PDB file of C-alpha atoms in Angstrom:
ATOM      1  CA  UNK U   1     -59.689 -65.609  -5.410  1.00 31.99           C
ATOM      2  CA  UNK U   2     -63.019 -67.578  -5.312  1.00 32.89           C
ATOM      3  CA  UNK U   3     -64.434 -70.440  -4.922  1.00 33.89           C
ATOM      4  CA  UNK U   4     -65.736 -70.652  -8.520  1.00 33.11           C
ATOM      5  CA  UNK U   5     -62.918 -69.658 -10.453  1.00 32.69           C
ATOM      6  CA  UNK U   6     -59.328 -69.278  -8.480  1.00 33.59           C
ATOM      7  CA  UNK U   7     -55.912 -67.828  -9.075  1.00 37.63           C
ATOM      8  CA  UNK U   8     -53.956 -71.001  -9.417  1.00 35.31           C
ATOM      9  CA  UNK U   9     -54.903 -73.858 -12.580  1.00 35.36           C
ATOM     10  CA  UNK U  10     -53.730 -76.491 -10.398  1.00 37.60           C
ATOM     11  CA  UNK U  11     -56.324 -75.955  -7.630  1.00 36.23           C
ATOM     12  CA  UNK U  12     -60.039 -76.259  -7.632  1.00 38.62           C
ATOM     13  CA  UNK U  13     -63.283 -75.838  -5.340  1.00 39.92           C
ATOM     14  CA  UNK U  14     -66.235 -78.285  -6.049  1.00 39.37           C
ATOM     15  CA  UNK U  15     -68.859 -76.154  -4.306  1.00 36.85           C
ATOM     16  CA  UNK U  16     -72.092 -77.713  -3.538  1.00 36.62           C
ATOM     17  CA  UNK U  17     -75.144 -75.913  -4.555  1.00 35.42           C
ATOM     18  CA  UNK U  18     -77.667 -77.822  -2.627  1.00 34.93           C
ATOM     19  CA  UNK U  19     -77.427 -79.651   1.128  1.00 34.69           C
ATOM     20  CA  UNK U  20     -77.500 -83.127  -0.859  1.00 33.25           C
ATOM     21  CA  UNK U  21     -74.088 -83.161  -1.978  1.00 37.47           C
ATOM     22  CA  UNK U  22     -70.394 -82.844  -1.050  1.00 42.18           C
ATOM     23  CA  UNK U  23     -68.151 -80.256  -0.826  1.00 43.78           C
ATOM     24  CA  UNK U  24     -64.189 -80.716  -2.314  1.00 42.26           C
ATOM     25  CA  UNK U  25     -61.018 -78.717  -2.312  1.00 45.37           C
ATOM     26  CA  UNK U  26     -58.667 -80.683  -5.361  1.00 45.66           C
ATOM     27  CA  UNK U  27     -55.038 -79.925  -5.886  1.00 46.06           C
ATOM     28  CA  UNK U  28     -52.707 -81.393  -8.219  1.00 45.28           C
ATOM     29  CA  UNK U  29     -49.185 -81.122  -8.198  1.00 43.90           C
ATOM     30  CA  UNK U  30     -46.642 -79.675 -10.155  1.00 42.78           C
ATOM     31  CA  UNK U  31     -44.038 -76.466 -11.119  1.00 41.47           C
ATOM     32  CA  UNK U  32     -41.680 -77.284  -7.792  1.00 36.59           C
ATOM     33  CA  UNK U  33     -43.090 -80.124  -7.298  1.00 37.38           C
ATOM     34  CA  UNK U  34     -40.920 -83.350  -7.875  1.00 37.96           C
ATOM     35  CA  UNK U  35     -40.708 -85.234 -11.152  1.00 35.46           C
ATOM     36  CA  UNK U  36     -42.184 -88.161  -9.539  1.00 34.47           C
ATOM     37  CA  UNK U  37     -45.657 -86.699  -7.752  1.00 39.33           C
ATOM     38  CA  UNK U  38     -46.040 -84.529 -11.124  1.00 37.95           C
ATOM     39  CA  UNK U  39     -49.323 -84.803 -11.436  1.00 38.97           C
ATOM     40  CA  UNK U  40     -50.272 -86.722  -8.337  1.00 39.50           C
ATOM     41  CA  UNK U  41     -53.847 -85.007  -6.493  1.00 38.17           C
ATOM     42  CA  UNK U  42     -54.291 -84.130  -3.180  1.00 39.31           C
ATOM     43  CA  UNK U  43     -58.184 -83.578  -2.019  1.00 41.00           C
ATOM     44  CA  UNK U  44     -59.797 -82.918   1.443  1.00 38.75           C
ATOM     45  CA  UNK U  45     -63.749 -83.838   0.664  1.00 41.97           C
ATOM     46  CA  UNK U  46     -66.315 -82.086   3.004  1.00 43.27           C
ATOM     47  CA  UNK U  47     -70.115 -84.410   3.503  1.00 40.93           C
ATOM     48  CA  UNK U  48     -73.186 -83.349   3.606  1.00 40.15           C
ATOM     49  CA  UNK U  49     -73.097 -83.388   7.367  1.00 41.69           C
ATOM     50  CA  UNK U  50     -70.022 -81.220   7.711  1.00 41.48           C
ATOM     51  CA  UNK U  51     -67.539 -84.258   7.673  1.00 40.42           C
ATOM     52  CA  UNK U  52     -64.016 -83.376   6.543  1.00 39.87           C
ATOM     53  CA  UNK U  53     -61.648 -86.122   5.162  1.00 42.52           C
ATOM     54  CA  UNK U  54     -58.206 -86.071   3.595  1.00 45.07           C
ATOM     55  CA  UNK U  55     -57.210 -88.307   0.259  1.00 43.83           C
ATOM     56  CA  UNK U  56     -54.329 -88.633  -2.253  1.00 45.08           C
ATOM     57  CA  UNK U  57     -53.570 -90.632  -5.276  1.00 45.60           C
ATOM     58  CA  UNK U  58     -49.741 -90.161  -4.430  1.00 44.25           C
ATOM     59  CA  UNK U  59     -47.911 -93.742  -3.486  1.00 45.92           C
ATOM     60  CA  UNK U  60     -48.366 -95.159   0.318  1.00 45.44           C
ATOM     61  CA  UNK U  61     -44.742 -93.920   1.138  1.00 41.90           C
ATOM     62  CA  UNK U  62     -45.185 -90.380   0.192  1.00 40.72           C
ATOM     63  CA  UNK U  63     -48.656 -90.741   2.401  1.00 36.73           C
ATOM     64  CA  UNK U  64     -48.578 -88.683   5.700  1.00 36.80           C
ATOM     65  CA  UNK U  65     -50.626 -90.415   8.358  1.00 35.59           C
ATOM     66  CA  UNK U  66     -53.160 -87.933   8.491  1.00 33.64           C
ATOM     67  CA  UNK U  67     -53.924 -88.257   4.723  1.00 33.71           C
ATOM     68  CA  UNK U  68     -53.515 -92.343   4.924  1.00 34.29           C
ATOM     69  CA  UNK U  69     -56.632 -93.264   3.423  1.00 30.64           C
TER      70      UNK U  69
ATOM     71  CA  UNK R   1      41.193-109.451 -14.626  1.00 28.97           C
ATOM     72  CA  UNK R   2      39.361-110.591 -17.701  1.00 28.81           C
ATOM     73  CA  UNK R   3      37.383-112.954 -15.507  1.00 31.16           C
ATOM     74  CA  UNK R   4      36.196-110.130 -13.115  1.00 29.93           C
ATOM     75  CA  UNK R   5      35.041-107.634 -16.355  1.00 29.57           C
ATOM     76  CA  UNK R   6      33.066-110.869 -17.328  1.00 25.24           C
ATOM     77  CA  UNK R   7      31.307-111.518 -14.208  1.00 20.28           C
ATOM     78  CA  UNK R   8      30.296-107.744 -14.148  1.00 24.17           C
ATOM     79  CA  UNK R   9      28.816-107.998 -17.105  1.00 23.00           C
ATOM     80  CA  UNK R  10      27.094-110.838 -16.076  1.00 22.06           C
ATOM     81  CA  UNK R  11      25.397-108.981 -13.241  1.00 20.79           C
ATOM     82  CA  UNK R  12      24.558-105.930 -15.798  1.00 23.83           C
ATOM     83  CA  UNK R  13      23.031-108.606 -17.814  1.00 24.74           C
ATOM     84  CA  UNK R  14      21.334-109.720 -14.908  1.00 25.81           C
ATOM     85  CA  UNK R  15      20.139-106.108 -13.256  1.00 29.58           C
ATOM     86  CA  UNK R  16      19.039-105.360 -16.954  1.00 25.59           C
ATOM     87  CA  UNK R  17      16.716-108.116 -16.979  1.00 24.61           C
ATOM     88  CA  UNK R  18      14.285-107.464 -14.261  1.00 24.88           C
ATOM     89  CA  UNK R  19      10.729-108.122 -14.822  1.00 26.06           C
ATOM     90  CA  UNK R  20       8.161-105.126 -15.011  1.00 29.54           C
ATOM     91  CA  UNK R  21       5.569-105.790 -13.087  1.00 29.57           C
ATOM     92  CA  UNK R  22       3.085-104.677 -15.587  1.00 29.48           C
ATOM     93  CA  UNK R  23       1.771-101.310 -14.151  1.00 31.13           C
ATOM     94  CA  UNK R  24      -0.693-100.474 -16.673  1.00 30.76           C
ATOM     95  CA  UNK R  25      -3.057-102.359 -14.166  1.00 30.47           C
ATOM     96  CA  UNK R  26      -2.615 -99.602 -11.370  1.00 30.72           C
ATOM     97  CA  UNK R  27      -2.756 -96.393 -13.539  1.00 32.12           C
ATOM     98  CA  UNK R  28      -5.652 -96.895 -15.432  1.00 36.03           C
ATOM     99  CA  UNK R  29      -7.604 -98.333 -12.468  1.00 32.04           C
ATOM    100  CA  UNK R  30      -6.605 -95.177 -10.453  1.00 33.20           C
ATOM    101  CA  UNK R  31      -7.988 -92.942 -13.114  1.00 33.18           C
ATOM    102  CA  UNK R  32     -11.049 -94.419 -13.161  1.00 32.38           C
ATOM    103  CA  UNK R  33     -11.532 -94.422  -9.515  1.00 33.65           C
ATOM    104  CA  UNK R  34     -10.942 -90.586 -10.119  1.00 33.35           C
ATOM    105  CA  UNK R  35     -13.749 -90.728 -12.766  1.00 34.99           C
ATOM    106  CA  UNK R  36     -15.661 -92.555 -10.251  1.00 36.71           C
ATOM    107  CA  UNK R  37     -15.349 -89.388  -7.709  1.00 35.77           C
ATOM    108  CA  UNK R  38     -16.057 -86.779 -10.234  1.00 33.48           C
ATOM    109  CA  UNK R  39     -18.916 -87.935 -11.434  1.00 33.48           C
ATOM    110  CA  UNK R  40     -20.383 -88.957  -8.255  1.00 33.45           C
ATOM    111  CA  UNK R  41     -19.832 -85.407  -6.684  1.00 33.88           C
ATOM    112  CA  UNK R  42     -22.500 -84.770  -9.331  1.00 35.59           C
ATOM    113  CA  UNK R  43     -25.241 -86.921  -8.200  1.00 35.07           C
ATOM    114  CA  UNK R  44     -25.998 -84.461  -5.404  1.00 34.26           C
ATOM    115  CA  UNK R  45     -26.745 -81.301  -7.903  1.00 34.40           C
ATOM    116  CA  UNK R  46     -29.052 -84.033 -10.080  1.00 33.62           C
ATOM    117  CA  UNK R  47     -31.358 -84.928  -7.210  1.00 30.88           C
ATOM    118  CA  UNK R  48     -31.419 -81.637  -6.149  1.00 29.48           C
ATOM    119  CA  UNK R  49     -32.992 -80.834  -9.466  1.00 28.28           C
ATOM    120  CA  UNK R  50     -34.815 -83.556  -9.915  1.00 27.36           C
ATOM    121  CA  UNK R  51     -36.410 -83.279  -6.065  1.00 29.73           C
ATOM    122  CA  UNK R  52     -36.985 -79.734  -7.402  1.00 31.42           C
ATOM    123  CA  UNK R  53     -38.842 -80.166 -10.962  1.00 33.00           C
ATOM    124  CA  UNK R  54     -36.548 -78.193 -12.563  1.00 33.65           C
ATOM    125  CA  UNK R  55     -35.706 -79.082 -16.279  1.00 36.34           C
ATOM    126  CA  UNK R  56     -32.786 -80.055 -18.080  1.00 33.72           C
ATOM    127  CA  UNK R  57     -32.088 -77.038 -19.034  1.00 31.57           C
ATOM    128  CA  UNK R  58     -32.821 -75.086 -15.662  1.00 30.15           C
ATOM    129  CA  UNK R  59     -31.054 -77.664 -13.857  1.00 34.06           C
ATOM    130  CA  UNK R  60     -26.853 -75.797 -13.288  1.00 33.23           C
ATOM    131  CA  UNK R  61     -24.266 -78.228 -12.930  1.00 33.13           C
ATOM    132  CA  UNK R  62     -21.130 -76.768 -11.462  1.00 33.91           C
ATOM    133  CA  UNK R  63     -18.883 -78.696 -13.442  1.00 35.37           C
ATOM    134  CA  UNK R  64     -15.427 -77.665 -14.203  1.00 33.78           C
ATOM    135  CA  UNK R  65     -13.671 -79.800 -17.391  1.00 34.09           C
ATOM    136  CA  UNK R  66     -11.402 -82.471 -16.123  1.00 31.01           C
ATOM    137  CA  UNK R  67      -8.261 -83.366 -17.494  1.00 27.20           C
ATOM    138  CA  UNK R  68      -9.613 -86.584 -18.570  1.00 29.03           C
ATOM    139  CA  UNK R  69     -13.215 -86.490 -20.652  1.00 29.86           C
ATOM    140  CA  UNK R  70     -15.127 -89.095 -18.390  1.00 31.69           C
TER     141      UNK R  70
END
């Protein structure tokens, strides 16, 4: 849809409205997800200076290396 | 021949008397290894729900009734 309001509840844009903040892309699990990363979060968080960086609150294991953070 | 009908019923006495191993042990434990298979072979449709998020009542188990409850 857009980046204010989407199609899907369990993601969401953080859009920045000035140059002095962040931009973030947030997605929690869920529906086919498994039991155990229910409601686990996924992000990828933009800076200011057009730095992109992957995080997760999911367990170490479950980690990919690219998201290890 | 008295003596002879005597000693065969000696060794009727005798065959009569064997000792029966007690095979309760071996049935039983045989049915529950069955048990032990059935069940199991459901552990692969559980995960599959449970990997999936499905709920209880979502999740189809293709279980046919077994002869014995467990």
């Amino acid at each position: 849809s857009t980046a204010a309001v989407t199609g899907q509840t369990g993601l969401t844009i953080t859009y920045p409205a000035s140059a002095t903040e962040s931009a973030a892309i947030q997605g929690t699990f869920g529906n086919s997800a498994a039991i155990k990363i229910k409601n686990q979060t996924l992000t990828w968080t933009r800076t200011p200076e057009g730095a992109w960086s992957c995080a997760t609150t999911v367990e170490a294991k479950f980690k990919p290396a690219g998201c290890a953070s | 021949t008295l003596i002879e009908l005597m000693i065969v019923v000696a060794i009727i006495g005798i065959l009569a008397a064997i000792a029966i191993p007690q095979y309760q042990n071996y049935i039983a434990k045989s049915q529950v290894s069955r048990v032990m298979s059935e069940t199991g072979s459901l552990k692969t449709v559980i995960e599959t729900c449970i990997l999936d998020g499905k709920t209880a009542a979502n999740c189809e188990l293709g279980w046919t009734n077994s002869n014995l409850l467990g």
